[PDB]
Short mmCIF file of C-alpha atoms in Angstrom, two decimals:
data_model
loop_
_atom_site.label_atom_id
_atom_site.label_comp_id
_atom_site.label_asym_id
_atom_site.label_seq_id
_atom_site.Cartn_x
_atom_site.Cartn_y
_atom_site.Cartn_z
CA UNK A 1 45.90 38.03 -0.09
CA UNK A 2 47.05 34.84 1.24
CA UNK A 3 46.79 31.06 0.63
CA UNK A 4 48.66 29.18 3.54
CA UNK A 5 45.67 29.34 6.14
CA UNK A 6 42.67 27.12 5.96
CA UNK A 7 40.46 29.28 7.38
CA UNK A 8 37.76 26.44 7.93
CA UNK A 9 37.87 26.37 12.09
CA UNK A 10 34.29 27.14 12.53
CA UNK A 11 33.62 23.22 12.76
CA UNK A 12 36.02 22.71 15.72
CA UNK A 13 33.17 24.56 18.21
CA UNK A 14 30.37 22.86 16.50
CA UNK A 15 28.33 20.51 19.83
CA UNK A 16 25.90 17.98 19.51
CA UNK A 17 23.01 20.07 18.76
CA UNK A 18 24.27 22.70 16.72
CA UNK A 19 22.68 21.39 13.86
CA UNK A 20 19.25 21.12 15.56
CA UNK A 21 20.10 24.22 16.62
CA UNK A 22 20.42 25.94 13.45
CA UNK A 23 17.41 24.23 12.29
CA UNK A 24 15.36 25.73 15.18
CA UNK A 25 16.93 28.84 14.15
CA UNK A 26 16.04 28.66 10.10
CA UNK A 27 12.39 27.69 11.19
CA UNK A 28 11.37 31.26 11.35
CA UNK A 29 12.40 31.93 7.23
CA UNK A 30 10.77 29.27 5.99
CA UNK A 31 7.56 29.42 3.84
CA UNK A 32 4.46 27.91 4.71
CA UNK A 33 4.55 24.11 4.27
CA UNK A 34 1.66 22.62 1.31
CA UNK A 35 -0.44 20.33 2.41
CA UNK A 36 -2.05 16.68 0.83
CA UNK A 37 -5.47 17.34 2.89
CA UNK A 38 -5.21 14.74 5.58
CA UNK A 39 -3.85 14.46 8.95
CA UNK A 40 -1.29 11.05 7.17
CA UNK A 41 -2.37 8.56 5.07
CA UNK A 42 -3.95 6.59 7.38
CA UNK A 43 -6.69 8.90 8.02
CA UNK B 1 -18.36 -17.78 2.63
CA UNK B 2 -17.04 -20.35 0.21
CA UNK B 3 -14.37 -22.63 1.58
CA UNK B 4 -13.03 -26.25 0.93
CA UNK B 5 -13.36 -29.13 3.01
CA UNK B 6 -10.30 -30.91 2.73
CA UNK B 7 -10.45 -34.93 3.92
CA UNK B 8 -8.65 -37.97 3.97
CA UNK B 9 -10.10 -41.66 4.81
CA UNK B 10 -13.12 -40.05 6.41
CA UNK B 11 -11.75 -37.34 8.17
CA UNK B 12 -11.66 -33.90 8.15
CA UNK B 13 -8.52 -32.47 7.75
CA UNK B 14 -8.80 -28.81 7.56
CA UNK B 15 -10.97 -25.52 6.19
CA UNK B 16 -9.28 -23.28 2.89
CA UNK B 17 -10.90 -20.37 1.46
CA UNK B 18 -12.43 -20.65 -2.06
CA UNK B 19 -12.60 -17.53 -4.24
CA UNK B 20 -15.74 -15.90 -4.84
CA UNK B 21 -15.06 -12.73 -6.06
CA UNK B 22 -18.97 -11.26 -4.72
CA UNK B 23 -18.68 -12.65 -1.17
CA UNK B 24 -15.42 -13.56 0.58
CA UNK B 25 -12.99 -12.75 -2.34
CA UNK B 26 -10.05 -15.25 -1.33
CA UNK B 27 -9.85 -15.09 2.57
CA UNK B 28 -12.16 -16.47 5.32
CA UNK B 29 -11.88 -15.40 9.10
CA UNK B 30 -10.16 -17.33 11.61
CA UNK B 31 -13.22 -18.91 13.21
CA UNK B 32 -14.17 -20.47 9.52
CA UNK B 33 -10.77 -21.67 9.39
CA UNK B 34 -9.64 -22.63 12.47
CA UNK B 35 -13.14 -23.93 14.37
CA UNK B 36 -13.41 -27.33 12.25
CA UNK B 37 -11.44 -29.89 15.22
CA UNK B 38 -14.93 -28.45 17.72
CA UNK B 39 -16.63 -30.97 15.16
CA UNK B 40 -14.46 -33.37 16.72
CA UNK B 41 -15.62 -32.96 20.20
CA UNK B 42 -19.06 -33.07 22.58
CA UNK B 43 -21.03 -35.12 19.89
CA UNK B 44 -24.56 -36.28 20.39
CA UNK B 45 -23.86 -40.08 18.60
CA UNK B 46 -26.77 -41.95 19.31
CA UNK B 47 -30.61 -41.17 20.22
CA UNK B 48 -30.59 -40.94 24.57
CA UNK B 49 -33.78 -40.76 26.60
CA UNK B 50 -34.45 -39.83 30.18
CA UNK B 51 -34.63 -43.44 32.40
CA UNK B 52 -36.13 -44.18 35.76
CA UNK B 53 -33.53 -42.05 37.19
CA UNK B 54 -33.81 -38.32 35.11
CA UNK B 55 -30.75 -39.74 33.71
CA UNK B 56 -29.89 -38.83 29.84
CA UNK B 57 -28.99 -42.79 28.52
CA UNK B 58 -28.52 -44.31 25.40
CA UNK B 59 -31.19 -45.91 23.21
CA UNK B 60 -32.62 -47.22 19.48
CA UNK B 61 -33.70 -44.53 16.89
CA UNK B 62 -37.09 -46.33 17.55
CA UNK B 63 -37.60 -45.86 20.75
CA UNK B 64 -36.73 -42.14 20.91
CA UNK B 65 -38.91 -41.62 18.04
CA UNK B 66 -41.98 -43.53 19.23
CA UNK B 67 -41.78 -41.71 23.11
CA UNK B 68 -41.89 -38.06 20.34
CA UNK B 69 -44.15 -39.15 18.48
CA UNK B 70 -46.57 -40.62 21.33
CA UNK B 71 -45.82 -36.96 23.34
CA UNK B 72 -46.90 -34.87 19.46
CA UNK B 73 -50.00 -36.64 19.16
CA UNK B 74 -51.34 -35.91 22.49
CA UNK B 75 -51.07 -32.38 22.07
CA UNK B 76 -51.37 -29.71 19.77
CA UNK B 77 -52.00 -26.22 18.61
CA UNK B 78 -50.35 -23.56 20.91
CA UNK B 79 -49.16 -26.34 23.18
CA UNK B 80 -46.60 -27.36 20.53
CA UNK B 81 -43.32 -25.03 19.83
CA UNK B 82 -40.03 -25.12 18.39
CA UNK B 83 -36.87 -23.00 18.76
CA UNK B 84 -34.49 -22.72 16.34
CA UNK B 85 -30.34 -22.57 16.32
CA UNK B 86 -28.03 -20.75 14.75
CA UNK B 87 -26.88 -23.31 12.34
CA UNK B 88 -29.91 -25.11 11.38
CA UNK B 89 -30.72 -25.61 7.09
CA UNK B 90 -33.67 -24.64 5.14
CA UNK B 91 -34.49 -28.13 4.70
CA UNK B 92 -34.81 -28.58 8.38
CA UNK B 93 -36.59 -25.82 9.03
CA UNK B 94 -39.20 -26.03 6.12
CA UNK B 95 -39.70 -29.61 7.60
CA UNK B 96 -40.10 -28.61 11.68
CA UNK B 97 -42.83 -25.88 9.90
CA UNK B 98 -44.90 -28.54 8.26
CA UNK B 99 -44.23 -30.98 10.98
CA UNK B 100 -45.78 -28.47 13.74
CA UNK B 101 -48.50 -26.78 11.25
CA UNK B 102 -50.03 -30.63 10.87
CA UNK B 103 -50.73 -30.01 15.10
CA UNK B 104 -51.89 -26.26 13.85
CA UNK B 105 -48.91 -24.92 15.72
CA UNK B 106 -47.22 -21.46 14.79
CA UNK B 107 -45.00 -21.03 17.74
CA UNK B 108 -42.06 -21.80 15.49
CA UNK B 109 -39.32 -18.98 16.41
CA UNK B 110 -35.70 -18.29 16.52
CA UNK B 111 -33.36 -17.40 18.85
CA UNK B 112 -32.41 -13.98 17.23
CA UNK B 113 -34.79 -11.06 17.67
CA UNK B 114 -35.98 -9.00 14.37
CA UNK B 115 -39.08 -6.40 15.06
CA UNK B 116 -42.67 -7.87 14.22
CA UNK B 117 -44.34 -4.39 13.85
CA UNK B 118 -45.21 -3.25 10.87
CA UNK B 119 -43.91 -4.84 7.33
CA UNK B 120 -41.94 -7.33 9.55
CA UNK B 121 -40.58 -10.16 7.82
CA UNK B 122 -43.59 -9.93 5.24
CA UNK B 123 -41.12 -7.66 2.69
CA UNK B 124 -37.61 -9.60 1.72
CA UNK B 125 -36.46 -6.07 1.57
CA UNK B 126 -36.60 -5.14 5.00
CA UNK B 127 -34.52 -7.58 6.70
CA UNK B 128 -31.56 -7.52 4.06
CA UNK B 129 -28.41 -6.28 3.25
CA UNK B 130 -29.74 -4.90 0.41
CA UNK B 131 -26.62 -3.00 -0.97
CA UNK B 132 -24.74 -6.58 -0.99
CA UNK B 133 -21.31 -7.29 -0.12
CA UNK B 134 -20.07 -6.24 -3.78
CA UNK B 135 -21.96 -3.12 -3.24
CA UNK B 136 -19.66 -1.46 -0.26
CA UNK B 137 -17.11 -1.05 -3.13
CA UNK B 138 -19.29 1.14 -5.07
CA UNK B 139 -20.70 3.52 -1.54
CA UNK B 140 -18.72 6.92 -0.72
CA UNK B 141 -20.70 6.87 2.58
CA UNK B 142 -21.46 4.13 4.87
CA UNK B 143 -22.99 4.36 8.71
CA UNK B 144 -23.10 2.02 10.75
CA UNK B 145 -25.75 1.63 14.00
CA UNK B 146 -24.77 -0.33 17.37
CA UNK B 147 -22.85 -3.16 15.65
CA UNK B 148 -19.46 -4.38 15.43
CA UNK B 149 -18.55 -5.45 11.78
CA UNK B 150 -15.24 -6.37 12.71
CA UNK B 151 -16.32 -9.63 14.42
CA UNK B 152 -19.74 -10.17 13.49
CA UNK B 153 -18.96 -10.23 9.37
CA UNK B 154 -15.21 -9.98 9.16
CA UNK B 155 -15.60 -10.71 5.75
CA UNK B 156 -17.69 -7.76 5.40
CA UNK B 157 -15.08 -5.18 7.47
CA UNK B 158 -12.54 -6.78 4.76
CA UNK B 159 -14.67 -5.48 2.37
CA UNK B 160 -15.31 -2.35 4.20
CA UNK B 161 -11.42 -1.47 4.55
CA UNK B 162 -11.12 -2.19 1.11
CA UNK B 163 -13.02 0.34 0.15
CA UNK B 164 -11.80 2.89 2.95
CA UNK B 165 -8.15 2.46 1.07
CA UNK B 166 -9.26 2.55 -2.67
CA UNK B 167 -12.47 4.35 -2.97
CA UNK B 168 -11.53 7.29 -0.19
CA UNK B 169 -14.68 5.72 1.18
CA UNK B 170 -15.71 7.79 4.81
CA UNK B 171 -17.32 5.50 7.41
CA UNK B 172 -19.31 6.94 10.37
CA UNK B 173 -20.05 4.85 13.39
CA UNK B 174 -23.18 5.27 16.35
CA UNK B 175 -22.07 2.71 19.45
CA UNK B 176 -19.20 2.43 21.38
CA UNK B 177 -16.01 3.14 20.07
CA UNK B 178 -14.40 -0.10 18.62
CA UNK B 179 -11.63 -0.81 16.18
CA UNK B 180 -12.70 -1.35 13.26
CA UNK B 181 -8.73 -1.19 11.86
CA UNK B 182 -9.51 1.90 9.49
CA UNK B 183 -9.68 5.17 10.49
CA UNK B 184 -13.99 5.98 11.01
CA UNK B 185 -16.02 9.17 12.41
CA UNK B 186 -17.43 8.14 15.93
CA UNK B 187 -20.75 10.09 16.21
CA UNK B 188 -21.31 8.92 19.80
CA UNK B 189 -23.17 5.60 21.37
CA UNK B 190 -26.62 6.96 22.68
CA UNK B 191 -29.38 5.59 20.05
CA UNK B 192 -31.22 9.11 20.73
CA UNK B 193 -28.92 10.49 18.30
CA UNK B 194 -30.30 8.84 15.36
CA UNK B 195 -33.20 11.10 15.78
CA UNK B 196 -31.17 13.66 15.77
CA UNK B 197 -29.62 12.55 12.42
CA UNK B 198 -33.30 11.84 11.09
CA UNK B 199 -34.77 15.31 11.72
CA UNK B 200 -31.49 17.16 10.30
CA UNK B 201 -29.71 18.87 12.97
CA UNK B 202 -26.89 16.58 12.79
CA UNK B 203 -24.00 17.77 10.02
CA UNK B 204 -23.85 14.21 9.48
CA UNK B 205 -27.48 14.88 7.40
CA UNK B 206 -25.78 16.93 5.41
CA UNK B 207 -23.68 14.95 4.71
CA UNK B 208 -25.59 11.90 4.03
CA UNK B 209 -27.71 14.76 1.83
CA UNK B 210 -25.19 15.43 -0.73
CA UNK B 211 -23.65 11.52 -0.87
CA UNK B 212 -23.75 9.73 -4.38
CA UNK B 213 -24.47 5.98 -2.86
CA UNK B 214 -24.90 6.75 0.79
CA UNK B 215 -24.90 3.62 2.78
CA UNK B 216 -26.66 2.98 6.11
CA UNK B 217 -26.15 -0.64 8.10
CA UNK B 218 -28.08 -1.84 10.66
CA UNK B 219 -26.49 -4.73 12.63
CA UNK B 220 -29.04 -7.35 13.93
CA UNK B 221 -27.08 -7.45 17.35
CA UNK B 222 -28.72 -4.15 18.12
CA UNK B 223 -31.99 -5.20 17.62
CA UNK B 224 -31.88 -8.01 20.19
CA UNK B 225 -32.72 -4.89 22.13
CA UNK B 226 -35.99 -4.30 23.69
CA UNK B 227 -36.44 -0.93 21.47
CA UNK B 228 -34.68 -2.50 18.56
CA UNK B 229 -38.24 -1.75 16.85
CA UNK B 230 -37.87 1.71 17.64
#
């Protein structure tokens, strides 16, 4: 047990794209998205 | 469409809409609005006749009308004819018919083609816009053949849209592909497909088939065509 380190570091390596990145990476999880039945609203 | 002539000491000062909830609800198209100062320019002011010359010059009502009337009595039947424009009255035109059936002429026409065959302009029916611009609000379906309602009734493609974005209304379209500023099927541009649409081999007749208040417009443009008939 110990509470003198902030272990919280993982942010320090974090690039520009490592959120995209993760988000590319969570894309394969997800459920299939619903749908309204058109293409947008302006069609 | 229902405007207001706005004038001051003789003038005329400009073109507003005026509501009318059946026709042009409270907009008119540029053109309506914005062609008025044309009235101002190129006007024919006083009677002219052809001199010596073949030159156009000015002259007395009197004159003008004696050298027509003189030229009318001489001939008549078939010889006599008369054209009209595209923004002549009813009262004129009632009165060039009477004037030119007194010399037993019938040559009175128009610039703008309609087919002649059959029913022709004997049944009201058949050269209307029989659904009326009210109507379009009430159609699911609507086609439209070789016309552009955009710019020849812009009024009407207000209408149109309207209904497009409150009634779900689904427009089809046979001619060349132009924006009509909604979203519309394009079927293609060659006229043979109409058959194709008529006999039922198109899914478009099935889907005119199963339509509530199917709609179908013909514009008159593309019966200035030689097989507008057809």
């Amino acid at each position: 047990f110990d509470n003198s380190t902030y272990r919280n570091l993982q942010h320090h390596e974090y690039s520009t794209y490592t959120f995209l990145d993760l988000n590319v990476e969570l894309s394969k999880f997800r459920m299939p998205q619903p749908s309204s039945g058109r293409q947008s609203p302006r069609h | 469409s229902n405007i207001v002539v706005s004038t001051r000491t003789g003038e005329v000062m400009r073109i507003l809409p005026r509501m009318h909830e059946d026709i042009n609800e409270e907009w008119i198209s540029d053109k309506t609005r914005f062609a008025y100062d044309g009235l101002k320019r190129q006007r024919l002011t006083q009677p002219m006749i052809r001199n010596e010359k073949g030159l156009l010059t000015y002259t007395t009502w009197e004159d003008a009308l004696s050298r027509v009337a003189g030229m009318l009595q001489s001939f008549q039947g078939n010889d006599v004819a008369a054209i009209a424009g595209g923004l002549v009255d009813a009262e004129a035109l009632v009165a060039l018919k009477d004037l030119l059936n007194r010399v037993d002429s019938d040559s009175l026409c128009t610039e703008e083609v309609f087919p002649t065959a059959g029913a022709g302009t004997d049944l009201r029916s058949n050269y209307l816009l029989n659904t009326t611009i009210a109507g379009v609000e009430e159609a699911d379906v609507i086609l439209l053949v070789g016309t552009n309602p955009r710019f020849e009734a812009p009024l009407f493609n207000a209408r149109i849209r309207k209904s497009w974005l409150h009634n779900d209304l689904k427009v089809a379209l046979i001619g060349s592909p132009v924006d009509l500023t909604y979203r519309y099927d394009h079927l293609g541009d060659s006229p043979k497909i109409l058959q194709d649409i008529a006999s039922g081999n198109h899914p478009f007749s099935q889907i005119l088939k199963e339509a509530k208040k199917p709609m179908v417009v013909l514009g008159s443009s593309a019966l200035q065509r030689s097989d507008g008939t057809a």
